[PDB]
Amino acid sequence: MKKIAILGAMEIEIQPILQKLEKYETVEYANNKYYVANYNGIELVVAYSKIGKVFSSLTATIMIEHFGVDALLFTGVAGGLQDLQVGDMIAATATVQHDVDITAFGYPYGKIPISEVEIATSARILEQAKVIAKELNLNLHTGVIATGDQFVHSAERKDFVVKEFDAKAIEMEGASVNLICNEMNIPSFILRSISDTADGDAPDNFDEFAKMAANRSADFVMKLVDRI
Amino acid sequence: QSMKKIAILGAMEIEIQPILQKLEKYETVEYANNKYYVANYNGIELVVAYSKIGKVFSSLTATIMIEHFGVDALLFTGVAGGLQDLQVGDMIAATATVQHDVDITAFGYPYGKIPISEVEIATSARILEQAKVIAKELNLNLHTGVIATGDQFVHSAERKDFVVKEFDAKAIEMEGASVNLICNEMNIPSFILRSISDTADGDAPDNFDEFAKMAANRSADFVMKLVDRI
Ligand SMILES: Nc1ncnc2[nH]cnc12
Ligand SMILES: Nc1ncnc2[nH]cnc12
Ligand code: NA
Ligand code: NA
Structure with a gap:
C-alpha cells in the first residue's frame, strides 16, 4: 500500500486533510480536482466527490482506475442511529443502501440482484483502526x-433504517464508495463522525456540528495513515 | 486510433443478449467484477456489458467503459416504466435525465438537486438528432x-404522480441518469434509449414480467440500427 486515496464528499471533509499536508499538487480530472502529495512516504490522492451515490461512485472509481490507489479511506460526517450521538465516531463493518427497493419482485430492501444487502469493509484496516483508537x-x-441519496431528518425514516438494517449511522456516500472498492478488490475504510441524529432537528444540528465532525474524522484518518 | 470505440450498455442480461446475438463473435474481458464483450462491428469497436441494476453499478460500469476501455461514446439500451402518454411497447430516447430519488430539500434544494450539479443533465444533442432522423427514415x-x-422499482400511482409533477418525466427507470451523469462528467457523448415494459403503477410488476424481454429487444434493435448508420 504505497498509494492511498483519502476521499470525502464535501469540501469541509477534506479541507483539514489538505491543511495538514500544506503543499500538494492539483490534478483536474473527471470534472473534479484531485490533490496529490508524498506524505512521509506514501502517495496520497485526496478529493471530495460531491454529494451522493453517483458522484462518490465516480470519484472512487477514478481514484482506483486512473490514479491506481492501493486502498481507499473515506472520511466524513453522518447522522447517528441507535446509540450514536454527536461527539461519536464510527467505522463501518459493512455498508448497505437503505434506499434500494426492488421489493416488487420479492427482493429484500437494500438488495440488488447479483449482489448482497451488506457489503463488508476491510477487516484488516478496521482492526488496525481499532488498535490505534485504543492507543x-x-x-x-x-x-x-x-x-x-436523501438527507434524513425524520423519526419515521430513521426507524425504518434501524429496524430493517440494524444500522448505526446514515449518510449519502459510504455504501457506494465501499461497493466500488469491493467490485475492484481494493481494501476500504469508511469513517464517519456524527453531526446530528437524523431526526427533525438534523438540519440545524448538521449546521452546528458538521465542521467539528469533519475535523474529527480527518484527524483520525491521518493518524491511521501515519501508522498504516 | 482508426476505429471509433462505442460502449453499448444495459443494466440486465436480457437487455444486452440481443446485442451479443447480432455479433455472434466477440472477446470476453473479465474486469471490475463483470464481463465486457468486445467486437468489431460496421468498422467500429463495440464494448458491450450489462452493469447490474441501479445507480451505483451503472455508474461503475459506465466509468470503466470510459476510463479503462477508452470509449468515445456510450449508447444505453434498456427497459423502463412509461409515464404520462407513454405506453407499453413505445420507445423513448432521453433529452435529459433526472435523479427522482435525490432529496436534500432539508437545506432548501429542489428535489433532484445535488449541490454543484444541475437537476436535469442533457444527453448528446447530436446523437439524439441522428436517432430521430433514423427513426423517421x-x-x-x-x-x-x-x-x-x-434506485426503486416504481409500482404506485402516488410515486408516479410525484415524479410527473416534479420533473415532467416521460419514463422512469434505475440507471439512465447515473449513466448520463458519468458521461457528462467525463465529456463523453451519451444516448439513453428505453422501451416501455409497464406504466409504473400497481400492475407494473406483472406487466414487466410479460413485456420486459419485448421491450429489451426493441431497444437493442434500434441501438444497432443507430450503430449501422454511424
Ligand atoms: N441525517 C443525515 N442524512 C444523510 N446524510 C447525512 N450526513 C450527516 N447527517 C446526515
Ligand atoms: N416501473 C419501473 N420502475 C423502475 N425501473 C423500471 N424498469 C422498467 N419498469 C420500471
Ligand atoms: Na506533508
Ligand atoms: Na454514543
Whole structure:
C-alpha cells in the first residue's frame, strides 16, 4: 500500500486533510480536482466527490482506475442511529443502501440482484483502526452504515433504517464508495463522525456540528495513515 | 486510433443478449467484477456489458467503459416504466435525465438537486438528432423526453404522480441518469434509449414480467440500427 486515496464528499471533509499536508499538487480530472502529495512516504490522492451515490461512485472509481490507489479511506460526517450521538465516531463493518427497493419482485430492501444487502469493509484496516483508537484513548464505534441519496431528518425514516438494517449511522456516500472498492478488490475504510441524529432537528444540528465532525474524522484518518 | 470505440450498455442480461446475438463473435474481458464483450462491428469497436441494476453499478460500469476501455461514446439500451402518454411497447430516447430519488430539500434544494450539479443533465444533442432522423427514415415512432431515474422499482400511482409533477418525466427507470451523469462528467457523448415494459403503477410488476424481454429487444434493435448508420 504505497498509494492511498483519502476521499470525502464535501469540501469541509477534506479541507483539514489538505491543511495538514500544506503543499500538494492539483490534478483536474473527471470534472473534479484531485490533490496529490508524498506524505512521509506514501502517495496520497485526496478529493471530495460531491454529494451522493453517483458522484462518490465516480470519484472512487477514478481514484482506483486512473490514479491506481492501493486502498481507499473515506472520511466524513453522518447522522447517528441507535446509540450514536454527536461527539461519536464510527467505522463501518459493512455498508448497505437503505434506499434500494426492488421489493416488487420479492427482493429484500437494500438488495440488488447479483449482489448482497451488506457489503463488508476491510477487516484488516478496521482492526488496525481499532488498535490505534485504543492507543489514542478514543472511542471508535463500529457497525453497519447505511447510505441513501436523501438527507434524513425524520423519526419515521430513521426507524425504518434501524429496524430493517440494524444500522448505526446514515449518510449519502459510504455504501457506494465501499461497493466500488469491493467490485475492484481494493481494501476500504469508511469513517464517519456524527453531526446530528437524523431526526427533525438534523438540519440545524448538521449546521452546528458538521465542521467539528469533519475535523474529527480527518484527524483520525491521518493518524491511521501515519501508522498504516 | 482508426476505429471509433462505442460502449453499448444495459443494466440486465436480457437487455444486452440481443446485442451479443447480432455479433455472434466477440472477446470476453473479465474486469471490475463483470464481463465486457468486445467486437468489431460496421468498422467500429463495440464494448458491450450489462452493469447490474441501479445507480451505483451503472455508474461503475459506465466509468470503466470510459476510463479503462477508452470509449468515445456510450449508447444505453434498456427497459423502463412509461409515464404520462407513454405506453407499453413505445420507445423513448432521453433529452435529459433526472435523479427522482435525490432529496436534500432539508437545506432548501429542489428535489433532484445535488449541490454543484444541475437537476436535469442533457444527453448528446447530436446523437439524439441522428436517432430521430433514423427513426423517421425507418418509419418508426420514437418518443423523446426527460427520463427519471432512482434506485426503486416504481409500482404506485402516488410515486408516479410525484415524479410527473416534479420533473415532467416521460419514463422512469434505475440507471439512465447515473449513466448520463458519468458521461457528462467525463465529456463523453451519451444516448439513453428505453422501451416501455409497464406504466409504473400497481400492475407494473406483472406487466414487466410479460413485456420486459419485448421491450429489451426493441431497444437493442434500434441501438444497432443507430450503430449501422454511424
Ligand atoms: N441525517 C443525515 N442524512 C444523510 N446524510 C447525512 N450526513 C450527516 N447527517 C446526515
Ligand atoms: N416501473 C419501473 N420502475 C423502475 N425501473 C423500471 N424498469 C422498467 N419498469 C420500471
Ligand atoms: Na506533508
Ligand atoms: Na454514543
